[PDB]
Design an enzyme around this catalytic site. Structure first.
Site: not given
Ligand SMILES: COc1ccc(S(=O)(=O)N(CC(C)C)C[C@@H](O)[C@H](Cc2ccccc2)NC(=O)O[C@H]2CO[C@H]3OC[C@H](OC)[C@H]32)cc1
Ligand SMILES: [Cl-]
Ligand SMILES: [Cl-]
Ligand code: NA
Lengths: 99, 99
Positions: B25-27
């Site tokens: 997960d690069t996000g």
């Molecule tokens: C159906 O299509 C989608 C369904 C869900 C998502 S998501 O945003 O909920 N998510 C899916 C994952 C959780 C299964 C994408 C992630 O990459 C998300 C993307 C993200 C990034 C920042 C804020 C919100 C969301 N990242 C995080 O939730 O990261 C968490 C964990 O590490 C920390 O770093 C960033 C977050 O801390 C802020 C924490 C997006 C599109």
């Protein structure tokens, strides 16, 4: 380009005539952008993540320019804390994970 | 390997002697895994995602194998919807994004 992951992989996007910063996010199925207006029809959707679900508007057939590369696809619009480019548009620009 | 994004980039990980599936997960800044037992002390952390925030348990210096690559680093344990390998361990296994 080749993007290392020491820091967040943020890029400039152009969508609906506006420049935004967005996260290239391989863990996102879908592309999710902060509240903005887009042309055409939309329908309501719920998408989840850590911390729960949010309600978004689903617009289809939207063109976005991602770090200079044009792609077309579905964009979800709603109260996401970060603009996210998900796999539906990462595939179109030929993005891969390599290790 | 080179992993395209037409499907979720799911890999097998090994942690605590157990095999599990996780998303590359690069996000994600951080690695987050579903409730499990880990050794040593933990510290509190709040992490924020699309829906809001959750409390997790932070375990440092945990040994974890990812798609056959060894990593040793921080693992967050809590109510995540799916096991996520974040940039803290993607960098240890040498992952880059390429397009
Ligand atoms: C159906 O299509 C989608 C369904 C869900 C998502 S998501 O945003 O909920 N998510 C899916 C994952 C959780 C299964 C994408 C992630 O990459 C998300 C993307 C993200 C990034 C920042 C804020 C919100 C969301 N990242 C995080 O939730 O990261 C968490 C964990 O590490 C920390 O770093 C960033 C977050 O801390 C802020 C924490 C997006 C599109
Ligand atoms: Cl799409
Ligand atoms: Cl391809
Ligand atoms: Na449309």
């Amino acid at each position: 380009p080749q993007i290392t992951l020491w820091k967040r992989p943020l890029v400039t996007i152009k969508i609906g005539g506006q420049l935004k910063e967005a996260l290239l996010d391989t863990g996102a199925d879908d592309t999710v952008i902060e509240e903005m207006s887009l042309p055409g029809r939309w329908k309501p959707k719920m998408i989840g993540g850590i911390g729960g679900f949010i309600k978004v508007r689903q617009y289809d057939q939207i063109i976005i320019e991602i770090a200079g590369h044009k792609a077309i696809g579905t964009v979800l619009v709603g109260p996401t804390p970060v603009n996210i480019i998900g796999r539906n548009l990462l595939t179109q620009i030929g993005a891969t994970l390599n290790f």
